[PDB]
Amino acid sequence: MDRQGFVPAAYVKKLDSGTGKELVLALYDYQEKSPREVTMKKGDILTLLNSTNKDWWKVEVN
């Protein structure tokens, strides 16, 4: 169900920090292209796990 992995940083937008975990908005549909990635749909609100790399951000997809 829930899956975790990397998506291209350009394809998500950070939401302002608030209560709990960091969140991003998925700007585009993105099907995972390699096992280390995950799939997202445009408009998904994703938990942001790691944004330390400029190219690849680790997210949770529910």
Side-chain angles (χ1 to χ4, degrees):
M1 96 297 112
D2 288 346
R3 307 266 173 201
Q4 304 186 350
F6 291 104
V7 297
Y11 304 163
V12 298
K13 177 180 188 171
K14 291 182 175 192
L15 306 184
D16 292 0
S17 304
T19 304
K21 297 172 187 181
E22 301 307 303
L23 299 174
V24 298
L25 170 68
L27 295 174
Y28 315 108
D29 288 354
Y30 183 76
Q31 190 172 328
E32 59 191 359
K33 306 178 167 296
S34 70
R36 69 191 188 182
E37 298 166 34
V38 289
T39 293
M40 61 186 183
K41 189 173 172 55
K42 180 168 163 45
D44 288 351
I45 302 294
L46 312 177
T47 301
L48 178 58
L49 305 182
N50 186 305
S51 59
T52 64
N53 187 267
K54 79 174 180 202
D55 295 314
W56 292 101
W57 289 356
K58 194 183 182 190
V59 298
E60 177 151 323
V61 176
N62 298 132

